[PDB]
Each structure stands twice: as C-alpha cells, then as structure tokens.
Amino acid sequence: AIRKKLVIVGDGACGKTCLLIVFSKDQFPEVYVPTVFENYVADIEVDGKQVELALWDTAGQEDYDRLRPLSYPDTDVILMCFSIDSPDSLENIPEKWTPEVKHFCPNVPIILVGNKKDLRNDEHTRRELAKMKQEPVKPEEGRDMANRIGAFGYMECSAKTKDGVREVFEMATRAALQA
Amino acid sequence: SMEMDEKDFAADSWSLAVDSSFLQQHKKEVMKQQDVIYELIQTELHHVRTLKIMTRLFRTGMLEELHLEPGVVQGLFPCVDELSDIHTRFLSQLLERRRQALCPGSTRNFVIHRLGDLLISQFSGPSAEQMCKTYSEFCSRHSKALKLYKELYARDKRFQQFIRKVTRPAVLKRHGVQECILLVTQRITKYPLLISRILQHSHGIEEERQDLTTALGLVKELLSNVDEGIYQLEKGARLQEIYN
Numbered sequence: 109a110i111r112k113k114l115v116i117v118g119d120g121a122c123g124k125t126c127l128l129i130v131f132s133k134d135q136f137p138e139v140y141v142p143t144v145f146e147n148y149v150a151d152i153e154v155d156g157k158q159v160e161l162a163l164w165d166t167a168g169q170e171d172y173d174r175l176r177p178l179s180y181p182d183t184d185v186i187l188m189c190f191s192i193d194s195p196d197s198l199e200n201i202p203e204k205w206t207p208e209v210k211h212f213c214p215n216v217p218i219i220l221v222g223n224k225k226d227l228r229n230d231e232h233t234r235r236e237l238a239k240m241k242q243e244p245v246k247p248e249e250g251r252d253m254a255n256r257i258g259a260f261g262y263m264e265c266s267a268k269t270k271d272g273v274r275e276v277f278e279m280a281t282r283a284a285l286q287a
Numbered sequence: 288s289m290e291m292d293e294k295d296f297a298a299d300s301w302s303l304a305v306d307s308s309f310l311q312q313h314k315k316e317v318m319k320q321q322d323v324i325y326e327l328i329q330t331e332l333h334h335v336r337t338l339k340i341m342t343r344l345f346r347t348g349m350l351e352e353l354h355l356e357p358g359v360v361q362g363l364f365p366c367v368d369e370l371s372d373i374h375t376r377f378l379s380q381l382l383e384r385r386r387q388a389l390c391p392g393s394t395r396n397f398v399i400h401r402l403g404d405l406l407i408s409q410f411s412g413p414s415a416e417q418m419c420k421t422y423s424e425f426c427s428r429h430s431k432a433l434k435l436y437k438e439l440y441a442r443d444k445r446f447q448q449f450i451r452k453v454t455r456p457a458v459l460k461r462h463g464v465q466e467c468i469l470l471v472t473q474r475i476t477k478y479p480l481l482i483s484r485i486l487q488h489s490h491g492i493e494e495e496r497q498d499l500t501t502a503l504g505l506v507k508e509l510l511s512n513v514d515e516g517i518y519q520l521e522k523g524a525r526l527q528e529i530y531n
C-alpha cells in the first residue's frame with residue numbers, strides 16, 4: 109500500500125466538490141449533498157497495485173492566489189476540472205490553471221476532466237446556453253484542449269449519475285504511479 | 288471530540304439528525320437552511336478535533352517520547368495553541384446556540400433561527416484581528432512545517448517509529464502531520480462557501496438575511512487580509528534571498 113496525493117483544480121462551479129464527495133462516499137448522497145469536502149484517503153487497487161490515494165479540493169481558494177498554492181506540495185496527480193454546461197470554464201483551462209499547475213507542479217501528470225456530462229442532454233441547459241450564443245462542451249473540444257495543454261489524458265464523468273466517476277480515480281492512480 | 292457532540296453530529300444531515308416526526312412539522316426552506324447550519328457546526332467540530340490531534344497527539348507525544356532539539360516541535364506545529372483557543376471558543380458558541388434551541392424533553396430536535404449575529408461577532412473586531420494575524424503566521428510557516436516533517440521522517444529512525452505508532456489507528460487514516468496542516472490552512476476558505484449557502488435559504492427574516500450578508504463580507508475581508516499577509520518561510524533561508 110503506497111501513498112499518493114491527488115488535488116482537483118478548476119473554476120468555481122466546475123463540479124469538483126460534488127465529484128470528490130460522490131467518489132469518497134460509498135453511500136450516494138440521496139438526502140443532502142455537503143457544501144464542502146474536507147479530505148479523504150481512498151483504498152484503490154488499480155491493475156493489481158494497492159494504493160492509498162489522498163484526495164484534496166481547492167474550492168474556496170480560487171480568489172486567493174497566495175493561499176491556494178499551499179494545496180500543491182507533494183501532489184502526484186492533478187485532476188483539472190471543467191463543466192460541460194459551461195464553455196467559459198473551459199476557456200480558462202489554458203490561460204489560467206494550466207500555467208499555475210505547471211509552475212507549482214513540474215512534471216506532475218494532469219488529467220483533464222469534463223464534469224456534468226449529463227447536462228449535454230438537458231433541455232434547460234441547451235436553452236440557457238443558446239441565449240448567450242453557446243452550447244454544451246463537445247467531446248472533441250475537450251480532447252483538443254487536453255491535447256493543447258499537454259494533459260496526460262482526457263476523461264468525462266457525471267457526479268449526478270456516477271457514470272465514469274470510478275474510471276477517473278483508477279486512471280489518476282495509474283498516472284500517480286508512473287515515474 | 289467528546290461523545291455527546293459526536294452523537295449529536297453523527298448523522299449525514301440535520302433532516303436525518305432530528306426525529307422524523309419533528310422534521311415533518313417544518314417547511315422545506317427551513318429544512319434546507321438547517322442542513323447547511325448543521326454542516327457548518329459538524330465541520331467546525333471536526334476542525335477543532337483536527338487541532339486536538341496536532342496538540343495532544345502529535346505535539347505533546349513528541350515532547351514526552353522524543354528528544355528533539357528545542358524549537359523543532361514549534362516549527363512542526365506553528366500557532367496550534369492559538370488556533371485551538373480561537374476555534375474552541377467559536378465551537379462553544381455554536382454548540383450553545385443549538386443547545387438553547389432544543390425542544391424541552393429532547394436532546395436532538397432544534398431549529399437555529401439566529402446565526403448571523405454570532406458570525407458577525409466571530410469575524411469582526413479583536414477576535415477577527417487575532418484570527419487574521421494567526422492565519423497569516425500559520426500559512427507563512429506551512430511549507431516550512433512540511434519540509435521539517437519530511438526531513439525528520441527521512442533522517443530519524445525514532446521519529447519514524449513514533450509516527451508509525453501514533454498514526455496506526457484506523458480513525459487516524461486522514462489525519463497524519465502533513466494532512467492536519469493542510470486541513471487547517473483549507474478551513475478558512477470553507478467559511479464563505481457555507482455561509483453563502485446558509486444565506487441562500489435565510490431570506491424569510493430580513494434581519495437574518497442582512498446579518499448573514501454582513502458576515503459573508505467580513506469573512507472575505509479577513510481572507511483577503513490573510514492572503515495579503517502571507518510570505519512563505521524557507522527552512523534555512525539566506526537574508527539575500529529574502530531582500531531580492
């Protein structure tokens with residue numbers, strides 16, 4: 109059982125808190141989704157290797173440029189999140205987050221994650237986005253962004269339905285183990 | 288933590304902590320407000336308990352079992368006594384507000400209607416000034432504390448043995464030295480998120496919506512002040528690196 113640290117980064121409502129909660133809680137939050145995530149050490153066995161994966165959130169730190177980098181020391185894998193219902197949050201991936209993560213985390217694998225993929229088929233989401241000339245983030249626009257920023261990989265998930273959530277965390281463990 | 292408070296905050300929400308027949312008597316908007324208020328207290332209980340692991344388990348255990356050079360323990364645990372006094376006072380006020388609000392004959396059914404005043408007191412004047420100065424100190428010594436822990440774990444066999452020993456219990460899985468330090472740094476940035484969501488369901492009484500709005504602004508003034516006061520200390524830094 110080796111120890112690895114995972115830190116999730118991304119804009120305000122990119123769904124990173126919801127994702128850490130839904131993965132860490134073996135018990136779906138049917139009654140109340142917590143506002144905050146403290147920390148968690150997950151027991152993961154990926155490709156036959158047992159790893160203790162410490163999970164950390166950066167929510168609440170987005171406006172504080174000196175407090176935020178205190179989350180980065182000894183990170184083994186970064187999950188870079190964006191919301192598929194917010195193309196604006198994707199535009200900030202190369203200009204703001206990627207340079208910060210490459211500066212404080214040299215050579216740490218980054219997995220670009222598109223959260224809330226279920227909103228791609230939501231009537232209210234498409235109707236609202238079209239009001240500001242937008243549309244849900246397309247799978248290829250996510251892949252191209254991951255490609256451009258030099259990400260280890262591109263993955264999509266849905267914290268609401270749990271689809272693809274376990275695959276993100278097992279893949280991030282494989283990324284953390286690579287040297 | 289103490290058993291009484293742990294049982295009071297063991298449920299996943301306020302809607303699950305109170306008796307089912309007491310919940311049925313309240314409007315949804317109230318249930319939603321009480322859920323976020325309950326989360327603010329439950330996470331404050333956990334915060335204070337994280338600081339007790341640092342002071343009573345790590346800090347004191349090191350002083351009584353190890354023979355470290357004076358000042359190494361303080362470098363590992365900056366401001367932990369001051370942080371423990373600030374947060375233990377805050378937690379006492381929150382738990383008493385909940386206690387006062389209990390129905391007679393019950394130890395678990397309550398509705399906290401007034402919270403804004405308590406948050407304005409905690410995040411204004413002297414108490415806020417002490418908290419601003421303590422968190423600027425703590426976060427400037429955060430990196431150094433981690434460098435110091437790593438240095439000691441990789442060089443001292445006895446320190447390594449002490450850590451393995453006290454961190455072995457399953458209840459300590461998320462609470463090693465390094466984790467406790469990041470837990471404390473991250474706490475301050477949780478308050479605006481919780482208060483904003485409490486405010487989102489506190490529009491029923493205007494004095495309350497106004498008090499929670501003032502409290503939110505005070506917590507952000509404090510956060511902006513702590514962020515501005517931060518300057519990372521380096522373990523063994525040279526004067527020339529500091530003045531350039």
Ligand SMILES: *CC(=O)NCc1ccccc1C
Nearest residue numbers: 123126127130141224267268
């Ligand atoms: C935060 C997120 O991505 N989805 C929110 C959600 C809604 C209903 C049930 C569970 C969750 C996490």
